RNA sequence: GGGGACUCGUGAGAGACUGCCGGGGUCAACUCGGAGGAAGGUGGGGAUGACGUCAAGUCAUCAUGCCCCUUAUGUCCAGGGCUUCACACAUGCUACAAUGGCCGGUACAAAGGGCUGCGAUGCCGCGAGGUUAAGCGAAUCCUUAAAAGCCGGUCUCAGUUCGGAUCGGGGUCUGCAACUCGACCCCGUGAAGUCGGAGUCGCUAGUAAUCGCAGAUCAGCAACGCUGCGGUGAAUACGUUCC
RNA sequence: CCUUACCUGGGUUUGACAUGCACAGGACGCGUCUAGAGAUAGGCGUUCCCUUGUGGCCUGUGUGCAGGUGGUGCAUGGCUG
């Protein structure tokens, strides 16, 4: 008896860990039946580039987009707390779509 | 490195009947990391060795191995300025490795069929006393005995 | 420039015609696509902690 | 080795030259176009491409038909010495 | 073993002695070799003169050889040259047209110094 | 040339990310904005002393979060000059922006605002040492820090040919990542073009 | 509750839980002699020492995943020697002290700035 | 379906620190050997480039003082040229074949990317490509068959079945447009060249070597370059006299 | 092509853009002849705001200026080896 399916796109483990983990119990807490923490892999989209402004040189630096998506659940089909759910989200830094 | 050797990476016996030495040969033949191939290779080598001589072909290689083997090196190091070189005793471990890397060389070289058919000719010739490595050996010790100074 | 700027936003007459630049100091080299920017400045911002999440790796 | 589907000329052109057609051939006619196709339509019509750096006039014939104003419009310089 | 050249080979496979002829490869020798139904590896000494024959014949009804072949190339060659476009300019100078830089390269075109 | 920003290094341990949102193909449109956002508010706030700039992009309207040594400079006449700045520049942002001026409790501890303290000193034509030797025991004596490297780059008095120099006091440890180790810059116009500087400031390590 | 193989690799991991029987060793018709043409892999797999006929013979092989090397695939043995200790521990002074009681998860060092996957340093010139 | 046991994913911890035995050693510093253990004595690696130097470099990333232009040294535009060569130099791709070329068959990555898009499936086309179109804004859809490898066959040591450069013809793609000046494919020739002077770089462990893979950039051109992944997988190290 | 800064040649030349002082009142977009393009050129669409004064703002005039991949790293920052 599933219905809510979360997404969550961060790129911060302690931030989606953190703030996810209080939103939803307290979405438990509302009285939503709701699936454990669902850690998922991670994701990096990685750059290189020369540091020189001239660029005459080989010298380089790696950088990486650590989006980060993990912990993300399943909520049974409770309206009472996902009217909540909806009216509560979480800082842009994480984005909250779900299905 | 200066001081301090490292130690090398343990080799172990050949999964045909037991022998580092082949094994060891395996990695001297090993091109572009085909170990597998270079494995059927020799064992080719192992069925025409059989074929020939109608015995053990690992230890028709134990023969040639010691006819080709010398234990005497023509070169240290730099003397001085006129000076060429100076003979010096060498150690059984790198005198057997030698042989070897003379037998694959003039395999490969002989542009006359497969390399296992090679490998076969030069396995007899030099367990036979006939290789041209074993000419090396000979090479090694006529051209030794020369300047029979201090030994580096 | 400061009108080749303008005509490089200039977005009618063959968008290939066009050319992608920078548009934060310009830039017509090494533009990356989504940052937009020229990869020199996109070093500034990397240090000053404009990027979501973009760190340096540590492989 | 493309435009599968027929010769392409420039437009601006290409109806000049329908017109000469209409009449008969006509004076060297001078053009920036480096890249138009040449067409049997084009023979007995000698007229002049901007090479890079002028106009410069060249006759047509069926051999051409597989050549573009720019193959008839030379621009760099070899040796001199 | 002939049709046009020589065509004669000992110990080949069929359709490399057909690579002998000025104007057929692997692929048209597979062709020709595939509408006789006989065999890409035969040598020259199995050969019949029904082989021949329809091999001629399909041969006539394919494509051509060199002499005709090579003159419709001179044709081509000299088609380039009368037109005297950039194409035919480098090979009036003996220069490469495939968007060749001879500067550094292009040592089979120029030669050797 | 060899030397870094140390929160390149603290980008996820000590320090926080300005660019407050997550964005897939709206980035671009955001970050394209942030530009002239953070060139224009940047320009003509010398006086308010900005430290830092964060920027939350949500509800479909910027905060924007102004690390300051003088909200009553941005503020102006009870918000005239921060709502000429804001509200104007709604229909840039993207339909509404809001401003949150910080107030910065010890603008001492903040490497750039000293930096630009001090530079602006040298643009006032005072004798650089004793400039130095002000800016360097403000920023010693006020903040409860554990160090700080001030370093000078130009023509120091207007020399044809320029140079450099720092005063390190205390402790600048910054081959060691848990340093807490404050970073900024200001670069001042000067008679003969402009003068850089850089300060770190070893305020402490980590919580 | 059957034998849990747990062991590494060089790249695409190898294990799964086992139960013994014959000795029949193999997986979906990839025997040792089908998976593993040559007999390297196959006799360090059979681990000499500890055989299906040295020990309680065991049947269901070890589950590939990540594809599996040819090379690396032969690291399954590992999770042998766990096996084994999850059987008992005689050998398990044996097999450490043989050699198979380690790691070996090495894979490659990082393509770095200016060189090659092998940091093949390119022909330098000094002049 | 059902399950959470493993794997896998993934948060947080433990664990290796001379911890430890014996021995040595100015007892200390320090160290030999050893147990245990997954690793034993900065595991490996990365990021990190002290103070300072070379008037190194850049006004063309950016910034900017002075000087200069400012009916033009700015601005707009078709086209050209930056892609030229009698020669030379450098870094690189492939070969100079039998540890080999080719037909046919065949298990196996990892890491990335994709709703402007990825194009599954299926259709057509000799193929490159073209049509239709699922699913997918993604661990699930697609990219996705990795290739080297392996069973067998062919060719049997040749400038030849090596090598595919040059050049003609004929097709595909992008873009309004592919001549200057793009990429790909089919046919056709099958060039030079048979292991390299003098000289010299590279390389100590999953190394080196070697075969593939995928991104960034882009209308298109990245299967020689640059940045990441992964397969197979060696050899030598007596030693510091000399460069 | 653009990119391109170079150049053949063609046009503009307070300008492509920012923007000050006055006047002026649609700008702007569409479509189209011309021209290689730029632009020229015709016709459409048209000035909200109270160009009620102010506001918006092109265009035009004149001027502040704009602008410069012009030089100057042996003026220099910055950044890099």
Not at chain 1, 31 to 53: D, F, H, M, Q, W
């Amino acid at each position: 008896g599933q219905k809510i399916r979360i997404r969550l796109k961060a790129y911060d483990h302690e931030a989606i860990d953190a703030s996810a983990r209080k939103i939803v119990e307290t979405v438990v807490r509302t009285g939503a039946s709701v699936v454990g923490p669902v850690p998922l892999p991670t994701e990096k989209n990685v750059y290189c580039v020369i540091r020189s402004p001239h660029k005459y040189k080989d010298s380089r630096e790696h950088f990486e987009m650590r989006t980060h998506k993990r912990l993300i659940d399943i909520i049974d089909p409770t309206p009472k707390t996902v009217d909540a759910l909806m009216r509560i989200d979480l800082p842009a830094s994480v984005d909250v779509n779900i299905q | 490195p200066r001081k301090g050797p490292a130690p090398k990476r343990p080799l172990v016996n050949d999964p045909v009947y037991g022998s580092q030495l082949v094994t060891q040969l395996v990695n001297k033949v090993l091109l572009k990391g085909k170990k597998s191939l270079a494995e059927r290779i020799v064992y080719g080598a192992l069925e025409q060795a059989r074929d020939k001589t109608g015995t053990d072909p690992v230890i028709t290689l134990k023969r040639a191995l010691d006819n080709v083997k010398p234990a005497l090196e023509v070169r240290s190091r730099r003397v001085g300025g006129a000076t060429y070189q100076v003979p010096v005793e060498v150690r059984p471990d790198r005198s057997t490795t030698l042989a070897l890397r003379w037998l694959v060389g003039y395999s490969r070289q002989r542009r006359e069929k497969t390399m296992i058919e090679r490998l076969a000719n030069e396995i007899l010739d030099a367990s036979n006393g006939l290789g041209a490595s074993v000419k090396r050996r000979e090479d090694t010790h006529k051209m030794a005995e020369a300047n029979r100074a201090f030994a580096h | 420039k400061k009108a080749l700027v303008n005509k490089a936003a200039g977005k009618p007459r063959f968008a290939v015609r066009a050319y992608t630049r920078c548009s934060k100091c310009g830039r017509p080299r090494a533009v990356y696509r989504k940052f937009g920017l020229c990869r020199i400045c996109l070093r500034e911002m990397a240090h000053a902690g404009e990027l979501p999440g973009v760190q340096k790796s540590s492989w | 080795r493309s435009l599968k589907k027929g010769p392409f000329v420039d437009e601006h052109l290409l109806k000049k030259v329908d017109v000469q057609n209409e009449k008969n051939t006509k004076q060297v006619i001078k053009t920036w176009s480096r890249r138009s196709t040449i067409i049997p339509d084009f023979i007995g019509h000698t007229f002049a491409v901007h090479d890079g750096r002028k106009h410069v006039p060249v006759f047509v014939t069926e051999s051409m038909v597989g050549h573009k104003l720019g193959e008839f419009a030379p621009t760099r310089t070899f040796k001199g010495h | 073993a002939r049709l046009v050249g020589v065509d004669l080979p000992r110990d080949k496979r069929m359709e490399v002695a057909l690579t002998y002829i000025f104007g057929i490869g692997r692929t048209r020798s597979n062709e020709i070799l595939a509408a006789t139904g006989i065999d890409r590896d035969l040598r020259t000494r199995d050969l019949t003169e029904e082989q021949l024959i329809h091999l001629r014949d399909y041969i006539e009804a394919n494509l051509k050889v060199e002499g005709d072949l090579r003159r419709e190339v001179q044709a081509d060659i000299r088609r380039k040259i009368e037109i005297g476009c950039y194409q035919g300019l480098r090979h009036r100078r003996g220069m490469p047209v495939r968007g060749q830089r001879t500067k550094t390269n292009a040592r089979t075109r120029k030669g050797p110094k | 040339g060899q030397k870094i920003n140390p929160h390149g290094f603290r980008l996820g341990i000590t320090t926080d990310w300005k660019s407050r949102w997550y964005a897939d193909k709206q980035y671009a449109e955001y970050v394209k904005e942030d530009v002239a956002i953070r060139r224009l508010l940047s320009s003509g706030l010398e006086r308010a002393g900005i430290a830092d700039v964060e920027i939350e992009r949500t509800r479909d309207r910027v905060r924007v979060d102004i690390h300051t040594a003088r909200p009553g400079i941005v503020i102006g006449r009870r918000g005239t000059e921060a709502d000429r700045i804001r509200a104007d520049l709604e229909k840039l942002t993207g339909k509404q922006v809001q401003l949150n001026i910080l107030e910065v409790k010890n603008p001492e501890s903040q490497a750039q605002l000293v930096a630009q303290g001090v530079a602006e000193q040298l643009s006032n034509r005072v004798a650089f040492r004793r400039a130095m030797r002000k800016a360097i025991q403000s920023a010693m004596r006020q903040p409860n820090v554990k160090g700080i490297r001030v370093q000078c780059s130009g023509r120091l008095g207007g020399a044809e040919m320029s140079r450099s120099e720092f005063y390190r006091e205390g402790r600048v440890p910054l081959h060691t990542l848990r340093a807490d180790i404050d970073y900024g810059l200001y670069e001042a116009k000067t008679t003969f073009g402009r003068i850089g500087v850089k300060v770190w400031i070893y305020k402490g390590d980590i919580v | 509750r059957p034998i849990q193989t747990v062991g590494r690799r060089k790249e695409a991991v190898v294990r799964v839980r086992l139960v013994p029987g014959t000795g029949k060793f193999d997986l979906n018709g990839r025997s040792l002699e089908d998976y593993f043409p040559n007999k390297v892999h196959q006799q360090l797999i059979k681990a000499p020492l500890v055989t299906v006929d040295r020990v309680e013979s065991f049947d269901i092989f070890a589950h590939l995943g990540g594809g599996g090397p040819s090379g690396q695939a032969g690291a399954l043995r590992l999770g042998i020697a766990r096996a084994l200790i999850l059987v008992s521990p005689e050998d398990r002074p044996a097999l450490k002290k043989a050699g198979f009681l380690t790691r070996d998860p090495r894979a490659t060092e990082r393509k770095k700035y200016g060189l090659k996957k092998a940091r093949k340093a390119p022909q330098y010139s000094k002049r």
